[PDB]
Amino acid sequence: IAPNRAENAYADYVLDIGKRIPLSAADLSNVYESVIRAVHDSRSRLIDQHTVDMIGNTVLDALSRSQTFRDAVSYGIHNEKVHIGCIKYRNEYELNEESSVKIDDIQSLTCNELYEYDVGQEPIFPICEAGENDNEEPYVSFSVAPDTDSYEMPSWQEGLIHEIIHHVTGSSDPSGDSNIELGPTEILARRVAQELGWSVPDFKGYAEPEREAHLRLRNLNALRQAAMRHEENERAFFERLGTISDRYEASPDFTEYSA
Numbered sequence: 592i593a594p595n596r597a598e599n600a601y602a603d604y605v606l607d608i609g610k611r612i613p614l615s616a617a618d619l620s621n622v623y624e625s626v627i628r629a630v631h632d633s634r635s636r637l638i639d640q641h642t643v644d645m646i647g648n649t650v651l652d653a654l655s656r657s658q659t660f661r662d663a664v665s666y667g668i669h670n671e672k673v674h675i676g677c678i679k680y681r682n683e684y685e686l687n688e689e690s691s692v693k694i695d696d697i698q699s700l701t702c703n704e705l706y707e708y709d710v711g712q713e714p715i716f717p718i719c720e721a722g723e724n725d726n727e728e729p730y731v732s733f734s735v736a737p738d739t740d741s742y743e744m745p746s747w748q749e750g751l752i753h754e755i756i757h758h759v760t761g762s763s764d765p766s767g768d769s770n771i772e773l774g775p776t777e778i779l780a781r782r783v784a785q786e787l788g789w790s791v792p793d794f795k796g797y798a799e800p801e802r803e804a805h806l807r808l809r810n811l812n813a814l815r816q817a818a819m820r821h822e823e824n825e826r827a828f829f830e831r832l833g834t835i836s837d838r839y840e841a842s843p844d845f846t847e848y849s850a
């Protein structure tokens with residue numbers, strides 16, 4: 592009898608069961624290829640090439656260097672969860688209701704209104720979730736990627752791994768809001784981060800105020816950085832973010848930014 596998917600015990604269950612049938616080198620090779628394909632096919636729903644690359648780098652690095660991630664992934668493949676190669680990626684955002692910002696839509700946002708608000712009143716929020724589309728195909732929506740070498744990068748990577756773990760292990764977050772338990776999804780993601788040398792803050796609970804503040808500020812900064820990357824194409828940037836947030840396809844070739 593397995594632990595419930597929302598209890599901390601579920602994390603160790605997943606790893607124990609996952610280690611029983613390890614990915615062969617050929618198995619891993621094929622998973623590696625499926626992820627590359629999946630991420631490449633995610634372009635039409637990601638904000639920019641940088642984010643495409645970073646998602647790819649992050650998942651592939653985790654597969655290459657983290658036994659925990661490989662165990663979680665193998666668990667999913669052999670125990671009727673999501674095969675990681677089936678997962679596509681998106682950068683869906685949502686207007687913040689409390690914001691004083693006066694805009695009808697994400698498309699209308701400007702770099703300015705993004706920088707004229709600190710955490711608490713920021714104009715938009717990323718949607719970070721493991722969901723499924725109409726055809727029941729799994730996707731992960733997550734923050735745009737922060738700049739290479741940014742403070743935000745390891746936390747962003749750990750958070751991305753977190754969402755994938757939902758899919759590939761079927762793990763949940765804690766049922767109630769807690770300051771002392773992380774839940775099995777976050778537990779696993781933290782182990783992966785530790786194995787890969789991603790420096791993330793040592794939080795105790797999934798809903799700890801410091802954790803909530805950290806995430807919000809990471810997201811705001813990742814978004815500011817992403818916008819600044821496309822400073823010359825400001826309208827194109829927010830229009831694409833809106834297109835994706837409305838659940839439409841944008842150019843898989845990012846022609847909106849083209850020289």
Ligand SMILES: [Mg+2]
Pocket residue numbers: 695696697
């Ligand atoms: Mg709208």
Ligand SMILES: [Zn+2]
Pocket residue numbers: 753754757763764776
């Ligand atoms: Zn979660």
